[PDB]
Structure 1
Amino acid sequence: VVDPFTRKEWFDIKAPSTFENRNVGKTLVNKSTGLKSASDALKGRVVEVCLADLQGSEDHSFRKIKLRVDEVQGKNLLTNFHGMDFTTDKLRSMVRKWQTLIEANVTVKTSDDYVLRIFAIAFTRKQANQVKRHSYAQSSHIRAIRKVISEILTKEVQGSTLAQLTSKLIPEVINKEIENATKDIFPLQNIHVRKVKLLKQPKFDVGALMALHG
């Protein structure tokens, strides 16, 4: 004597700008009854979707993305950058035995006071013409590499908030430039920013929030 199916006021999710398709998907809410409606109550739900989906290309078949809902109008609600995380299976495949892992992170602030932390992971490359079955680093060299990753990472940010951050990650200049400064010290391969967590997002600023909506 219920069945909330024939009651579910439906809705559609839209994607941000600096990507490909701004059309994400479909959802389920409720009848916008007075006092606790379907208005400002829910909204802020967040979606995990691979960006090989929302971009269409397949050279991005891991780098999963987390989008947070902010504003909603005219049977339509957008979303801003809220997360980027790698996939279990991908690293599970990345971490192969007989080599040195390297991990580092750092807390940082963008121009528009979006406070977050970014990560970094890389593996010593077995150079060709090599005999030794394993190839390990030299700790001190690992100190060095982590140091430079820290420098570079805290250099790329403090630049036009999410928008530009995503604009630096999507084409991965970070990876290739870490690769650039790296090869002087020690081989190293893969090299992925792997993960970045938001923790202290600023205020609403609805106007400036409409910065990726044409």
Structure 2
Amino acid sequence: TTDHYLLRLFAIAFTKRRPNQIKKTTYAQSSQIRAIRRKMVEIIQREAASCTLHQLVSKLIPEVIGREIEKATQGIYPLQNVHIRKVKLLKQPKFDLGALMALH
């Protein structure tokens, strides 16, 4: 983030079974999976690199990221549900009571 917090985002995304279909397996091809994962990492990088941590949590709460991944991956293969399953803060290099009290 812009406040120099490094963090890992783990996103999960299940494939959409299209209504009015007859075939039982909704398998995406492997190249299609690689394209989906490329668009997923592109979306989460482009929409998590610009904001601070408080705006990132405010976007994580109503799941705007998974909604935009669902909206932008449906030209490659439609996805049943995209969630971000883990956020892990690795290093926080600052202790600042100014922003930490501007939160509270």
Q: Percent identity?
A: 66
Deviation at 1:177, TM superposition (A): 0.6
**Partners in 1 of 2:93 and 2:45 — Cα distance?**
19
Give TM-score scaled by structure 2 length: 0.93
- In the other structure, the counterpart of 1:78 is none
Within the alignment, does 1:140 sit opposite 2:50 as a pair?
no
Please give the alpha-carbon distance, in whole angstroms, between the structure 2 residues aligned to 1:170 and 1:180: 18
Q: Structure 1: where are the runs of 5+ without partners? A: 1-109
TM-score (norm 1): 0.47
Name the SS for the 1:209 alignment partner: helix
Matched, 1:152 2:33: no
The structure with the largest alpha-carbon Rg is: 1
CA RMSD in angstroms, aligned pairs only: 1.1
Amino acid at match of 1:141: Q
Measure the CA separation in 2 of the matches of 1:132 and 1:139: 19
> Secondary structure of the equivalent of 1:154?
helix
- What is the DSSP-based 3-state SS (H/G/I as helix, E as strand, rest coil) of the residue aligned with 1:194? strand
Question: Is 1:195–2:65 an aligned residue pair?
Answer: no
Question: Paired residues, what number?
Answer: 104
Instruction: Detail structure 1 runs of 4+ shifted over 2 Å in the superposition.
Output: 158-161
Instruction: Find 1:178's aligned residue among 63, 66, 69.
Output: 69
Distance 2:43 2:10 in 1: 12
SS of residue paired to 2:19: coil
Higher helix fraction (1 or 2): 2
State the distance in 1 between where 2:32 and 2:83 align: 19
Of the two structures, which has the highest relative contact order with CA contacts closer than 8 Å and spacing of 6 or more? 2
